[PDB]
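User: Hi! Is it possible to get a structure for several chains at once, not just one? Here's what I have:
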Amino acid sequence: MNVSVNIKNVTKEYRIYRTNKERMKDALIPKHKNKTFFALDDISLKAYEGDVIGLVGINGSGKSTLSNIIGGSLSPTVGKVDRNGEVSVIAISAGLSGQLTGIENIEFKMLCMGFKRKEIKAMTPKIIEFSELGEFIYQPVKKYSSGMRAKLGFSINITVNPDILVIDEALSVGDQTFAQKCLDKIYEFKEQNKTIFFVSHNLGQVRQFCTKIAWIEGGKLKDYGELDDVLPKYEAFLNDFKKKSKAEQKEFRNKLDESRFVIK
Amino acid sequence: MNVSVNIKNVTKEYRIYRTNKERMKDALIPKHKNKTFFALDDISLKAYEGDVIGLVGINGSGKSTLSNIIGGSLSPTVGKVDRNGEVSVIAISAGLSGQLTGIENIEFKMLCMGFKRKEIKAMTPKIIEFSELGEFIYQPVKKYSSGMRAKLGFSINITVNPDILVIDEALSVGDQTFAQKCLDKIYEFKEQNKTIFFVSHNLGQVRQFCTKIAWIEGGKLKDYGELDDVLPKYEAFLNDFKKKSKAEQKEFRNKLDESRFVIK
Amino acid sequence: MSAIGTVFKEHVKNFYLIQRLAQFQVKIINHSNYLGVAWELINPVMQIMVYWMVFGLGIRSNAPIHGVPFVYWLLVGISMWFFINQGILEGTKAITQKFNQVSKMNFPLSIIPTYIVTSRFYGHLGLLLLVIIACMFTGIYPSIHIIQLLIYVPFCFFLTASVTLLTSTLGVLVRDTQMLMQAILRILFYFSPILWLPKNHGISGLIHEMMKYNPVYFIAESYRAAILYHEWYFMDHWKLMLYNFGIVAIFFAIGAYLHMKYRDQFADFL
Amino acid sequence: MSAIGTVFKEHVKNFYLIQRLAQFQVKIINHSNYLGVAWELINPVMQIMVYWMVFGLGIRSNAPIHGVPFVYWLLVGISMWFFINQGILEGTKAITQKFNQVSKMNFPLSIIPTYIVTSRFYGHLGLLLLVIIACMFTGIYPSIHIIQLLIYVPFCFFLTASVTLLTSTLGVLVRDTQMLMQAILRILFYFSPILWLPKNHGISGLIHEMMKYNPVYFIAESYRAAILYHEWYFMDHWKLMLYNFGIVAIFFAIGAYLHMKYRDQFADFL
Ligand SMILES: Cc1c(CC(=O)N2CCC[C@@H]2C(=O)O)c(=O)oc2c(C)c3occ(-c4ccc(Cl)cc4)c3cc12
Ligand SMILES: Cc1c(CC(=O)N2CCC[C@@H]2C(=O)O)c(=O)oc2c(C)c3occ(-c4ccc(Cl)cc4)c3cc12
Ligand SMILES: Nc1ncnc2c1ncn2[C@@H]1O[C@H](COP(=O)(O)OP(=O)(O)OP(O)(O)=S)[C@@H](O)[C@H]1O
Ligand SMILES: Nc1ncnc2c1ncn2[C@@H]1O[C@H](COP(=O)(O)OP(=O)(O)OP(O)(O)=S)[C@@H](O)[C@H]1O
Ligand SMILES: [Mg+2]
Ligand SMILES: [Mg+2]
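Assistant: Yes, the chains can be modeled jointly so their relative placement is included. Here is the combined structure:
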């Protein structure tokens, strides 16, 4: 039952400054204080092995911040987070250079990831075959369409084998043919008990892909558990929000904004 | 029955060069010839008034090229295209500057669009209300999340009233609450008989939003007509492709690649 | 004849758009700095100091030119150089950097170099006002002849704009030209009356006769005649005026024709 | 003591990564040019020409220094300046420009300025080889003393790297410093023995005593002693060697401490 990722009291503050001159003013005098925006607050999570967790919520909830903190790219202001293995993150926009070709991009990205050359030499064909680009693997990435760039990024990221994988809204641009192949790859990954996080706004894909659901509201983990319990509550909340009047939705958003903001 | 957009024999060629030195070689001597990649071939379309057309196809088909040519951003190598009114395009990634604030971005984008100041002064509040960003309308766009940037871009683009609107994969990041509001806006636009193009990989949204379907395969308009006829054929093609073996899919892709490429 | 007409109508119609986009660019470039747009004035003022310590204190041993101290001579001659250099260098890359953002929308592409040049004109105006203010401490006070600036300050701007209208186009077609531009600018700094005055009567006489073909020579000398020498410059040197007008006319005509010729195929080259 | 150790271990372990990323950057910068990486050699070679036409032909009337023609004196003294200038200027912005791409992945952040400096070291090596080849046409042939380059060529690189390791960090904290850097570099060009030799015995004597504190003075003079003067430089001027070693040690120590102190909060500042 080993805990693949453990989360203790993670909290991320961001300081609001209307202008850079206010930043200068608070830099000159340490006594100055400004309003602080709380991206996260008191998040506690426990991810086990062989678990697929889908994060659900409205825009501005804080799921991308949580995925970045799990990946280590962001440092929590208060709290801690530990991972048993090494974590790999697939994002909506893969970082590729339009000037370099496909093979040059494979080499550049796999070097930056932390692979020595001997592995790259043996791993290039498999990535080339998985990409399905063909002749365009020789031309620069700026000539590619968005779907092909997404395919190349996914192919590079999946071939290296992560102990923990965090996919964040990366399958929106791919077609159904690529989606089926990605689903099969997810089955193969599930065979190895690795922990996979899936962030998507397509509820059909969340139903088909995941097994557990975490629900975050206003930078606070609202409900974590089995999908069959959490997902109906999220759907009911969505329908209720759709039933409200415009003024009621505005006042709900204002209440959330007041809760998140504070002067300290 | 006025033809809002008319398309005659549009054809887009792109010249393939392995290296820039080959480009230098063909620039020095006009007798040099290299292989040419045919993004589009002999496309003929006729869009009427009060029509919602959804473009469907696999990755690399040529729907984004067609939308760009309709919007005028790309010039056809052979053929012509005319539009009765002025065309506005909503893309997946709105062009915004992370350094500028929300209101500065509204002003910058509406100036670049071609609006004189007096309209901007009266149009700013409505956009601010539609965005739902609130306090973050004062902070720079680089602090925003992807959903909020998409909301701001959609709010700016929809408030200016296009005679023809072309939405291309822009609602992938928005949540269901924003999707319902966008659907209501599409109803209001349909009231005014304006022609709307919808590009999306969510078949549920295509069912809920559109009324006619165009299907493009390998840079060729495979089937244009009523959705109830075209869409089942596209779904059948997708299922058949999923049933094929990996070698058969590879040979189909190779045949398409051979058909698209030519030396001339 | 159609290309010149079209570019002229675009620039005439989009005056306010040019100004406002120039102001937005000035705002964008200095966003993260603590001091902000003040760096539009601090950057040239410091450079002049270096050019005074080397060429004025070290070389020349601080000797006067035409009865004027070298510091004010150099100050008046150096005011337009930073604007010219920066405007040409950035307008060469303007279209390449800014085509994608405005390609989807419909927006005249002739004004892309001009609004970037306008972003640099404001700092020149501020520095020139500061120079005229600081010239008063010696005992040099404004006169009637300063009205000549109304002809001379605009001309410089026009010249720069014309060059960019050509080079930007070429910058899309061939990238290497951008690099080349830098070198040429350096030459035009040193074979000019900005830092030195040619000695004449010798090989320096040939250098003088060759420098007379530089437009920077005319701009610097005309500014000095308006502010310092108290003299109607166009009375003695109208041939230079005509030659420079012809140069800017030819530059504008060729640039407009080339821009209109390749405007539709910019995406293919870029 | 922990920060210095950590940065040293990172740089020692990631040598091949530094080299390969430097080569990729060299490839990226010259992608669209027709001539390509040849522009890594054409750009400085042209600039030297200008610096020879102004300071060698115009000023000095082409007179010899220490029995050597001015052209080869200047050629040997100017070889490292372009590398130093470009390396410092770009390594100041390296972290700011490149943090986002490698932030998501785990990758040591100390080597970001060093691989960008390595991208500029290659052009210096090519230009230095060309200089040594071209010096043969006068009658100056390589000697034993040239082995001193094995100590002098690396040191220059080290110096540049150290400075960037500091400035890059500061560049994240305060943007204005980047702008300031440019000005400082210009001063270090002109108060140096690159273009001129101080006359001594006077106010120029004080200028000489002040220039002796410039590390560029030591680098230029040591290169000239190795290639041109045929003299063991460290025998007479070992005090300068010790002072320069102390300078680079202090720069590296302070930069390493500052980089390790603010490394975790780089996203908040950026
Ligand atoms: C004086 C000078 C010559 C003249 C020179 O050296 N020459 C040429 C032929 C023989 C004659 C001589 O031997 O004096 C030069 O060429 O560059 C210079 C550069 C590049 C210089 O940067 C800075 C100074 C400088 C600044 C302030 C103070 Cl207080 C003192 C100095 C400076 C002087 C010269
Ligand atoms: C000669 C010269 C002085 C010296 C000068 O003018 N001085 C200073 C005190 C009095 C003495 C004089 O009156 O001669 C200077 O300062 O800058 C110069 C700059 C900025 C120059 O750029 C280019 C030349 C140049 C190049 C080639 C040829 Cl073939 C001929 C010229 C050039 C000469 C001088
Ligand atoms: N540097 C920052 N300063 C202030 N607020 C920030 C900053 N970065 C992000 N935020 C805010 O933090 C909140 C959560 O960030 P995100 O995780 O990116 O949003 P999100 O919950 O993922 O919503 P999505 O990605 O559109 S579904 C949002 O309201 C952001 O605007
Ligand atoms: N400059 C170019 N040179 C060569 N081929 C190009 C160029 N630009 C685009 N293409 C190709 O043209 C084809 C069609 O382009 P797009 O319209 O962008 O693709 P698409 O059909 O929209 O597929 P999507 O957007 O991923 S669903 C693709 O195979 C592109 O790789
Ligand atoms: Mg997100
Ligand atoms: Mg597309």
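Chain D has one domain: 2-269. Residues 2-269 of chain D form one domain.

User: Great, thank you!
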